[PDB]
Amino acid sequence: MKKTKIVCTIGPKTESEEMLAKMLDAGMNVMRLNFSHGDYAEHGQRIQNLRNVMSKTGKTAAILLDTKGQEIRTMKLEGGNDVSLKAGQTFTFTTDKSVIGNSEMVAVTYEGFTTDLSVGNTVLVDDGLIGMEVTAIEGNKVICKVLNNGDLGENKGVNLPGVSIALPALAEKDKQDLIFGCEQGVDFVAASFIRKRSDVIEIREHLKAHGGENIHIISKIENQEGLNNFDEILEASDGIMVARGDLGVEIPVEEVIFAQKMMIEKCIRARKVVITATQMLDSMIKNPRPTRAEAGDVANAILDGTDAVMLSGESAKGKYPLEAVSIMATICERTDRVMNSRLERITEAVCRGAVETAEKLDAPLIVVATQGGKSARAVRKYFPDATILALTTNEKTAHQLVLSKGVVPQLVKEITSTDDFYRLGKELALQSGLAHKGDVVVMVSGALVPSGTTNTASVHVL
Amino acid sequence: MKKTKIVCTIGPKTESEEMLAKMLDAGMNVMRLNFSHGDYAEHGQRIQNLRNVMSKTGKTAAILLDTKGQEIRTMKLEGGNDVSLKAGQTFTFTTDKSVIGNSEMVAVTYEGFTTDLSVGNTVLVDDGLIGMEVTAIEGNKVICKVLNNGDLGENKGVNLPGVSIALPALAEKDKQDLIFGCEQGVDFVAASFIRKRSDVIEIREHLKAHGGENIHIISKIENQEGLNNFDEILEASDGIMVARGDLGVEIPVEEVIFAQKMMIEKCIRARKVVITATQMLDSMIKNPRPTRAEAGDVANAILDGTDAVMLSGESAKGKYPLEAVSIMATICERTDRVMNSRLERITEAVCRGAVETAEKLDAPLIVVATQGGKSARAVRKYFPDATILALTTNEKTAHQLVLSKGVVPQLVKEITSTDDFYRLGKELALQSGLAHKGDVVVMVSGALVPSGTTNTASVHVL
Amino acid sequence: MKKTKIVCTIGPKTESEEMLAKMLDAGMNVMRLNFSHGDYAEHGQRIQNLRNVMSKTGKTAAILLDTKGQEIRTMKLEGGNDVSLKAGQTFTFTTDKSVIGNSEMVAVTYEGFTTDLSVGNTVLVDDGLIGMEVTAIEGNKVICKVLNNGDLGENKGVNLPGVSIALPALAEKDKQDLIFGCEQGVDFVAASFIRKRSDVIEIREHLKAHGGENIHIISKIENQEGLNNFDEILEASDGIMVARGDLGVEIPVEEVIFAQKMMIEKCIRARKVVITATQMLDSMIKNPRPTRAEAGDVANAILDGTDAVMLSGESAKGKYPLEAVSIMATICERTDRVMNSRLELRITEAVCRGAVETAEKLDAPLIVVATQGGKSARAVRKYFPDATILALTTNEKTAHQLVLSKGVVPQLVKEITSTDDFYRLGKELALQSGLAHKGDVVVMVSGALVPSGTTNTASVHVL
Amino acid sequence: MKKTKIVCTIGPKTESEEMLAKMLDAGMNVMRLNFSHGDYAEHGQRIQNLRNVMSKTGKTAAILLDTKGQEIRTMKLEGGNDVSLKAGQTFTFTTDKSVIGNSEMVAVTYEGFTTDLSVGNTVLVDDGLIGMEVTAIEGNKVICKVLNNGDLGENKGVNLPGVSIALPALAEKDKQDLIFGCEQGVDFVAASFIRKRSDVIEIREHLKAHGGENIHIISKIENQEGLNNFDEILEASDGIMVARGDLGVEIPVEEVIFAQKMMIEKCIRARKVVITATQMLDSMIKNPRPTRAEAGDVANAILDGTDAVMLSGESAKGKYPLEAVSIMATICERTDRVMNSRLELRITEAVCRGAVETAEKLDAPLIVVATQGGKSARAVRKYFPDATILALTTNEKTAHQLVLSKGVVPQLVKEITSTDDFYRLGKELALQSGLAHKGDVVVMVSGALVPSGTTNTASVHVL
Description:
The structure is a homotetramer. Chain A is α/β, with parallel strands linked by helices. Chain A has a domain at 78-159: PK beta-barrel domain-like (M1 Pyruvate Kinase, Domain 3, Beta Barrel), CATH 2.40.33. Chain A is 37% helix and 22% strand. Chain A is elongated. Chain A starts with a strand and ends with a strand. Chains in contact: A-B, A-D, B-C, C-D. The interface between C and D is medium-sized, with 31 and 31 residues.
């Protein structure tokens, strides 16, 4: 084999060295650490275990840290008892956190609820199970009409479609979590509930302040506001996580398929990695095979053009982690097999021409020299049949490229000249097993240029 | 709006005249009668009610009859108690129907079980919940090794991947059911578990014997054998029902997406209508909105190029029938909106040229004269932006065209000449509301030809 | 096969019925009568002879009347002797026609010479052999500086590049010649030295006043002014005669190839017939085989996409008339053979383009077209179909005129009352034409329920 | 700028340094020395004069030696008087060179005339003016039936269409002329009447024996036999001279345009230089402006895609040498201006095609190419780039030869040791050439770690 990359959330069932080794064997490329749960010691040991496996086997994975993020939630109910809300009733939210709730009123965690909402706005509670219309806003109370019957439990999610929420990018938790990722040298940070350009900036400025200027920020698009500000969010991020399940809560359901497709398309166009996540193989938490619906949705995200797909509970807490990775890997291989190149700046011209040439000469391999990974990602843009071997002296870059579709990173000593790159690239092509005596390879690099620019393509026979 | 057509299975919640009228308003095009259940009186009254609504409102629907078909099933268990089968155990099937089962053995309904199976074959029970390997075949017994733990209830489905089953197309039930459809003048027969070309032939020869030579046979592809013989099944059928859920039971799960896509593609190429069915909006049996996964799978089947999508329990027995039709209709409209024409025999040349011309002159409407419906279906092949108005003197043809994507049938008195067709077609274009003074329309017909051939295209301004 | 049509100028050598019959055999499609020479009796008899032959053999040709036009010429010299003009000298033109000329001065035929020129203009004499710059205009004198050495003979042609000459399109001779054309029922008038849109209108109004509203005007582009106004001229004409040799006198020589190609392209896009004329096979006036350059030039005009090519002296006065027509037809057949169709808002365009695209997709040898005025046959030809075009018309003028359009075979028929009748009879006539046979596919193009001038219907039939 | 290259034949009128300097100014790229005439001293001095001018002005030209070749000719007549041969008569050629001829018989220069002909063959005399069919061959006589009337003068050329003449490619004169070419270090040899692959080999082996293995052979296709064997000839040659006038004598006249076009197309596909020659601007031997047909023919050869065009008498003996070069260069500039690139297994092809596609996508005025042998500069030219090609070479012969290739500017340089050094210095030389400026994009093409003859690298730089 597959070209599509696999992110796996690691949890108790899969955190050991033995289990991680079997995970990589099955097709895992990137370890996701979900900082909604666990403490620094647990997560630190997962990091150590994977690096132990990496060092022992010579395999390369990346580590992605997923922030908890800022969420609005209902709070507590009398006795912790669910309550039945009836369509048509008045129901009131209050910013007063001291308030334990009941069928007429509940507290919400967000002090700005009375500010950002207006009469006529929609309030969705518990993954959009219960809908409500704001009818009045008085003091600390948001007064509403309940639009549909539903049962209210404690501590449920609140969604405010088409209302801009004035929550900061980072909780105090997330600030400390991000420093830990810097100390640990993670390759990616995935930021939850990105709403706008400034959210991404705040994250970048926090990481630069702790030696993480090279950590790639993957913005999670999880709601209406993020989708609306997607272009500026993309421009500020290094990649995108499309979280269909969360987004589905806030936008018309028929629109979600086309939001996913749009976002993947724009990421590809931008040379920025994209992960398709949530509701992938959830049924395998309890079952050893996925549903038909599950396999088809994943394959369609790969056809949409995703770089990577993600497992969540399936691999973290589920009974059948290895099985989920394997069938995910099979769906990737089956679907990648049948995709084609898309051939439609100097960098674009050269990389596009390099893939077209590769295809015309039936080259199994495009070999690329990259410091930061841009040129490997510029080639990936055109969905080459050929595998991409990215040679870099930068270890972070080598890890990050693991996430990009169809890229095999390779770490090397600094290469001093273009002709040296051809000599060594040719040898590394053979040593990689990705090509053999007689095969043609296309070699992409930057000669006499500021990094960030790729301007040279060269054809060699091994 | 939409062009994609909606089949609805009608049941108790939706059988009344009032309900059917609201169903058509919401987007239903074709009534499906599922003859797995109900008796002739129930089904007869559903037919009558829809014709009453049709006559009152002037709206046009079609009636499709869905046969129960031949299935292999396990039978009875001692006391009707589920039993736990353990991986590794021996378990034996017997063709002896007198046998009430237990954890070591059960009877199967099919006498040919001992014939068609061989040592090493796989036996799947209950939608593939429990797998088993045949180890020996002695007398009336098929001896097996249980491959995975599972619980066996009574009367469960048996699947025999990659084994040809020697069951006839028709049960005695289905023969009588088909005569009833002929007596009632249904527009379509959907035949369950079509395995091969001869199954379709047997159905055709039964219908011709009862005055149903004009009833279109829609073959249901529900298993490995049908998929393997798909080309000959297509050649013999009038259209195809792709039943992903059933097919999923028998073939590798990663393959199902590509089987669906292949089948839709070949049907389009063949000018034969195709329905995408099962596991569409099942969650709406109990819930007023679909899941994100559900909406995305449906939209992807429309992008694959399906003529029609089908609701099953959602509309027959579910709490929220009208809601399911409406959101299905919204997904059609949203997805159809963004599809494009596909422009790549005399008939093909003319119809393809007619759509290309229509698109070049920005024609909102292609007007077609058809006796049997072929020429309307030949135009539909190229996914025109323009709506197709099919003028026919044949009432059955008018009903059947309701299923074809983007076709608005219209019944007319016989049209005696090509120039008469232009005169009247122009007036009917205006009366339809589909086009206005000044619009261009393209008019497709057969002049001086044996029916089955379309050879003339003409541009007129209304 | 050939598709390209051949215009032949008829003169003493080719005016007999015997000769015209052999000319048609060899490939002549259209008789050009050049009204620079001969009187009405000669021309009347050429017309009669061809119609006799047409009547006897059943063959169809068209008749084109080519006007002499307005020419400016120098006049006579002392003793009838040439004079040698030296670069640098003063030289003077005078409108005084009594003046017998010499190395300092000569008369010109055009009394408005002193009006239409200005100081600094260039005067070209004898097909641009001698060039001169105007330095002063005094009374009846245009005083000039001779730009290059040369010998001036008597009665030589004068060209005034980028000077608008203020003469009407038609001289007295030309008005009378066109009245004769109306009397004779000619199919085409080719008008000399068309300079601007109003010239075409003057001719249109003249022909209409004398019953010739249905005669097609072919405007001859022969100079800078015509070329500059080429768009408005094409728009007003029915077709164009590209007269490369005359154009060559007035514009930079490297530009003539591109003027020819541009003018042909635009005529094709306009659905209007174009003839490539002048300096085709001239060497064959004296010789039975053309030069390599000659045959190469004609073929390149055909590849440029001209409807027709024209013989001049070669076929009128020269020693090898039939040979010139014959090798011209071979060059046509050899060059048409290797050309391809060109597939590229309007209903008529969409339908005709599609009819050719279908023809080629179904390998159809024949496209059958119904026409009243010839427009629809010309819209199909625009796309250079492989198939021959069989044009059915009840209009005789249209039947004749279409003989000039590339790849078109006209057929006169009784009125066809309906589209389906057009298919029935169209099929029968396709077989009778020999252009197609049982089993062939033909594409049939017509207008159903439309104002004539609009083509909106295409239909595929097996014979 | 122009891209098309100009070959000029030098003779008495153009052999001085003054004249060659003005010729270069006007657009001459390559001096043709025609060894049909002049002796070694004249030719030696023409070579010296051009190198003096080249040395003084820093301009680069190439030198091409054109052999006379093997000709068959009739010989003398009684009294030196023409004789009139009448269609139908018997007429006899004799290999007996003592025979002074008359209206019944004339001698031919080729002793193998009686061997290589057969009954039924056609004999063409005086550029095909008179044709004859062989009826009998007896002893030293080839007895013929005259097919058409004509007048036979003395010493006229004989053509034998579709008869393989059994003479070697090189006569005694030609072997000596090529030895002189090696002595003079000429860049090209153009060999007359190349008929088959072995002819090219005989020349290749001769030049190699005399230190001329690096001299490029341009085979002249001048007859039917050469044309029939054209593929094997191109494969063995470095380039082709399309001699339309001579070809015209032997093949049907309507075929010559298509022979020219086919031969140019195939040379372009082969990465091999092609010259279009003979009957370009001949009228300018006597006249200071060409005919319209002449200028149209040259431009059509350029649009066909020739690398170079050739002046003959126009520039050697004629009265208006500089004028002919000048208007030839204008026709080049006017015609190259409006041409487009042509984008269409091999590594070298893929890379070069891509380098032009990139150049055009990035609006690059210059493609800079590194070459030892000239192959890679010629592979880029194959696709008719808008950009000028700047070819860097350490090889002087290659620097001269590339002057004939369309759109190529050679530059001699010190050896370049690495690909990155090729970029550094390539950029500097692009600015110094004037062909590009600060901010322009250039595409740079070379071979990295490959056998010379292979081009595999393309790189985009901003100056």
